[PDB]
Amino acid sequence: GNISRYYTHWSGSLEMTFMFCGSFMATGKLILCYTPPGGSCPTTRETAMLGTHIVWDFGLQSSITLIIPWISGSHYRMFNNANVGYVTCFMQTNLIVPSESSDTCSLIGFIAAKDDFSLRLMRDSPDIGQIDHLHGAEAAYQ
Amino acid sequence: VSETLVENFLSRAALVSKRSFEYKDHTSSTAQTDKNFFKWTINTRSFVQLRRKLELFTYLRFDAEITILTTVAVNGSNNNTYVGLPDLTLQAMFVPTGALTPEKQDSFHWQSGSNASVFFKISDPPARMTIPFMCINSAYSVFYDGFAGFEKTGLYGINPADTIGNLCVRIVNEHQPVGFTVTVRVYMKPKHIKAWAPRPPRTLPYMSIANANYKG
Amino acid sequence: VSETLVENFLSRAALVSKRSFEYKDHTSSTAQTDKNFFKWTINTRSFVQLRRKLELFTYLRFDAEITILTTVAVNGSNNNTYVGLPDLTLQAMFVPTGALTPEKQDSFHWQSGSNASVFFKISDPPARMTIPFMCINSAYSVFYDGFAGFEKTGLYGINPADTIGNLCVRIVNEHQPVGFTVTVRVYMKPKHIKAWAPRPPRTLPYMSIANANYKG
Amino acid sequence: ANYCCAYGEWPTDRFYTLRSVKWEATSTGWWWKLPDALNNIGMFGQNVQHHYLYRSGFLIHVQCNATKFHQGALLVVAIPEHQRGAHNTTTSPGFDDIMKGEAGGTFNHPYVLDDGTSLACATIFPHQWINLRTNNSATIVLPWMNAAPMDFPLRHNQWTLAIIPVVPLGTRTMSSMVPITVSIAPMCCEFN
Amino acid sequence: ANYCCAYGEWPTDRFYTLRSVKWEATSTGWWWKLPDALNNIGMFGQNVQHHYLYRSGFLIHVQCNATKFHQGALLVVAIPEHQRGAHNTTTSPGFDDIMKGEAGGTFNHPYVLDDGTSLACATIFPHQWINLRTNNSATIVLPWMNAAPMDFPLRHNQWTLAIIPVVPLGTRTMSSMVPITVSIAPMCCEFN
Amino acid sequence: ANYCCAYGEWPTDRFYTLRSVKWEATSTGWWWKLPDALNNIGMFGQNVQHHYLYRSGFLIHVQCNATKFHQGALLVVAIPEHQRGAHNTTTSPGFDDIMKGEAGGTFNHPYVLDDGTSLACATIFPHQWINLRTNNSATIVLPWMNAAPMDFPLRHNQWTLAIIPVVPLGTRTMSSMVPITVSIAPMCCEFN
């Protein structure tokens, strides 16, 4: 995101990785759903299952990787004057943990660009604004 | 047979903007958004002749060459003594789409390193730079049979693509004790022109720039 | 894929200093150290945008290209008759580290043969010179996790190496009967850039130039 | 039967037959926006609804049912990116009167094609002639016709099929009536 | 056991084991400046005292002693030239709070790494993940990492090893405790 | 992983995952009629609605999420043409309590399988065992199983997947809970 904010047109496929960070004996299932750019994010499990999805059993597997298909951000809007796609997660089952372990588990996610990513038309990032003046600024001139 | 090629037919330098702006030190807050600088979005529908010549093909792909010729006239007031016309330097900045356009003569956007700028003097050969093909599609759409936004409010015939960008010209010099009138004349000449799907010519003189309405 | 190379990503000319100084004949002793000359130590942390762009790699090696564009405005006082703006010549001297920086407009350091100087006129294309890589180490240290001096008083994050040097600009002409305001605009563009050890970007806007303190 | 292949090139057999239009002695013409029509009616429509990107090229067949005692000439022309304007107003045409669906629209100024151009020079586009003394049918094949490899069917129309009677229909009895049938078949049926 | 070799390259077995740190449910993180630590304690320290120039490359091993009922994720990251800043003040950090010795320091704003950057993008540095359900150890090899062939260990720190708990340690009993052991072994042991 | 291929034979990857059922210490069992379920929910359902004849063979996967401290045995059995009867009445079962849809039903007399047969001899059918100390999953492949080459999915159920806990689930705490997930994938996806 930070690097893409320095450019105007981006295109390519993203990859997303999720890591489960619960106990060794924690078990359960999750449904990861991807929706194409033209559509609405599902709200419930059965309408989520209609589209493309993957059932993740984090009892055995600890990390899951799903590849977002190739997408050109500029054509899809770019101040058409968003909704480029969603990734949602639903609980297929409950979370089963032993009594000795903690009853709350956590999930983290990573994102990266594939080798087909492209950037064009470098611009000025709006992330940090021009501070009127920093603390030591006249030292260079004196 | 070489005279009637599309490249020779369309690659003629034509005046596309002839705006002029005042320069004097406006102590009072008046004449906003045009105090000391001139802004123009790069289009081709401004002039009827060039618009009709271009509106013969559905798709075009070309590089625009910009020549900026500027003249200064003695401020039509105050002392008439012809002390001379000082060598004022000018800054012409090309702002591609998706970037920020300056709103005042002293905004920080004039110092951005992303936007390419040209500094030239009033007593030099006119400045010249060529803008490359800057569309996300493979060619410009002279005609667009569609709506821009995904909402129904989106305007008809306006393509979110194209929109080459904006051209901003200002006087770099801080206000002299005597003001002046600056006339900016900019010429555009397409280059490396490719054309597709020829169309019948246009009768029934134009009624607007945004659309193709007619008075029949 | 060539647009996203490090050379194209960092090799953009950016304004790095926009200081202006008065020129009139100061008979009285006032406005010291900036009577008729402008001094600036060559750094990159002055402007937030360029500082953040550079602060993405631990080590950098580049040659700095300096362009000095200067404009003169009519002295905002006295007689308003536009007699014209005389062709004043300017001297820009590059003082590398370990040398003596001038303290006044008429010091003997301006005549030193060791320091390289550039003489240019107000009515010419802007002066331009390229400073080579001038560090004792193999690359510049954008970040330095150490103390400069061997004493405990040494400042944190300041490397005794680097410190490209100082740029000094003055008006060679002896004081005319009428003073003037001179604005000096200097642009820096890195060239032949090499980068090492990329770093995460910087949030939490900067609070100082010397250090990397934050307001969280 | 002797189809017109538009510009020289060559890129499933559903042939969605539209409702026939009534050709009178006072008819001005009819037009259909190809992506605008042909969707929300069939499997092509359901695919267009389920996908943001679609591929086409179409295949137009126009038929006239007339006897040997009928006379008249029909110009069948496919216009790429036919951006139409309004009449005696500076406002732009709206969504309601641009997107007519499978019903289609009718020309009100066929001499200028509702654009301000000339109907006389409309032959520069891919076209066929229907003279009701030599032939009564016309077939036109179309290419992709887009500046980008992808587009949104719900927002942008690629082609505009126009049928304009240059010579009005005539018979001894002034109650003449000839039906015109239009069939459109998408090609390669790609939706992604 | 499946070490991370930093940037792709490859340049005595003392393995100075530091005192173990206490990982609680409210811990923020720990950091050690590699030349700052590991000296004044052993033969490496005596050599660093006797020489103005030294050569390194180090070898970091991090171990966690947890049962199968423990949960949590640890990010072990080595930051080159980690110049840290202060908080809510324009003054620079001092020698006393920069040079912590073998004891090391603790992060007070691990989300920004005490620099003003983002902890999310800290994976760009040489790093390893410790998830207490798949592995409990991490090994990192480091290069020379200096602009000059020579440097002064007493004044300049080359690397900063940081251990940040992204996912807090948890168990049914809220009195959880997992010790973390760090071992550092200099490489090539050159001092001149 | 070591699937049961029913009777010795071997005949798209959609794997419609049903809602998980709650296995308690007092559960009796669950059953699903394979053509009755799996339709009106997906593309298989839309094809079944659009066609009078359909082809199948299915692929059943059953999973249990339990820890090492859980105990219990599950019998997963697929019964061909499981015509179930009522209890203490001579009237036949009705459409409402025969066609339960994707929700499925629950056994009220699992010892006799709601038929009057014996649960002990239910192993003669294609079946798998789920003992929560050696395995936690079971996979069963099914054949066509019909006397005629054609049948009507809306009126006749070909298979009945039954899950019966022979050994009740148990733990030291009597609030035990193990979810069971069932996934069904039609094979050859033929509809005509």
Residue by residue, DSSP assigns F111-138 as TTTTTTS-SGGGGGSSEEEEETTT-SEE
Report the C-alpha gap between D21 and D25 in whole angstroms: 13
Q: Tell me, what DSSP letter sits at residue D37?
A: T
Written as six digits, the tokens of F81 are 């043409």
* Other CB atoms within 10 Å distance of the CB of residue E94: 12
Provide the 3-class DSSP secondary structure of residue D80. Answer: strand
Burial environment of residue E111 by CB neighbours within 10 A (0 to 12, 13 to 18, 19 or more)? middle
Pairwise CB contact (< 8 Å): B86 & C83: no
Pairwise CB contact (< 8 Å): B136 & A81: no
Report the C-alpha gap between A95 and C143 in whole angstroms: 46
Q: Which pairs count as long-range contacts for D129-132, CB under 8 Å and 24+ apart, including other chains? A: D129/D73, D129/D74, D129/D75, D129/D76, D130/D62, D130/D64, D130/D73, D130/D74, D130/D75, D130/D76, D131/D72, D131/D73, D131/D74, D132/D64, D132/D66, D132/D70, D132/D71, D132/D72, D132/D73, D132/D74, D132/D169, D132/D178
Helix (H) or strand (E) holding E97: helix E95-98
Report E:1-60 residues touching C (Cβ under 8 A). Answer: 7, 33
Helix (H) or strand (E) holding F183: strand F178-184
Q: From start to end of E47-132, where are the E strands?
A: 54-55, 59-64, 71-80, 127-131
Question: F61, F13 in Cβ contact below 8 A?
Answer: no
D181 beta partners:
D63
Least Cα separation, residue A35 to chain D (angstroms)? 11
CB distance from F66 to chain A under 8 Å?
yes
Question: D11, D146 in Cβ contact below 8 A?
Answer: no
* Chain B residues whose beta carbon lies within 8 Å of the beta carbon of residue C75: 177
Q: Which of E51, E31, E53, E49 is nearest to E40 (CA)?
A: E49
* Chain E residues whose beta carbon lies within 8 Å of the beta carbon of residue C140: 147
* Chain B residues whose beta carbon lies within 8 Å of the beta carbon of residue A75: 136, 161
If you measure CA to CA, which chain E residue comes closest to A2? E121
Q: Which residue has the tokens 């202060």?
A: E86
Report the C-alpha gap between B185 and B70 in whole angstroms: 6
Provide the 3-class DSSP secondary structure of residue F180. Answer: strand
Provide the 3-class DSSP secondary structure of residue C17. Answer: strand
Helix (H) or strand (E) holding C90: strand C89-96
Q: Which pairs count as long-range contacts for E148-153, CB under 8 Å and 24+ apart, including other chains? A: E148/C136, E148/C137, E148/C138, E148/C161, E150/E53, E151/E53, E151/E54, E152/C146, E152/C150, E152/E52, E152/E53, E153/E35, E153/E39, E153/E48, E153/E54
Least Cα separation, residue B211 to chain D (angstroms)? 6
If you measure CA to CA, which chain B residue comes closest to C68? B119
Which residues are within 8 A (CB) of A56 and not within 5 positions of it... i.e. 6 or more apart? A18, A29, A30, A31, A32, A64
3-state helix, strand, coil in chain D (%, to 5): 10, 35, 55
* Other CB atoms within 10 Å distance of the CB of residue A133: 9
Q: Would you say how long chain C is, in residues?
A: 216
* Chain A residues whose beta carbon lies within 8 Å of the beta carbon of residue F173: 99
Provide the 3-class DSSP secondary structure of residue A88. Answer: strand
If you measure CA to CA, which chain E residue comes closest to A110? E120
The approach used to solve this structure was cryo-EM
Resolution value, angstrom units: 2.4
CB distance from A59 to chain F under 8 Å?
yes
Pairwise CB contact (< 8 Å): A102 & E172: yes
Pairwise CB contact (< 8 Å): D52 & A38: yes
Chains touching B (3+ CB pairs < 8 Å): A, C, D
C-alpha torsion angle, residues B47, B50, B56, B58 (rounded to 10): -70
Least Cα separation, residue A106 to chain E (angstroms)? 7
Least Cα separation, residue A81 to chain E (angstroms)? 33
* Chain E residues whose beta carbon lies within 8 Å of the beta carbon of residue C154: 155
Q: What are phi and psi of C141, to 5 degrees?
A: -105, 100
Least Cα separation, residue C72 to chain B (angstroms)? 7
Q: From start to end of F10-153, where are the E strands?
A: 16-17, 21-23, 30-33, 54-55, 59-64, 71-80, 127-131, 137-141
Report the C-alpha gap between B169 and B20 in whole angstroms: 11
Pick from E71, E121, E123: which is nearest to A101 by CB? E71
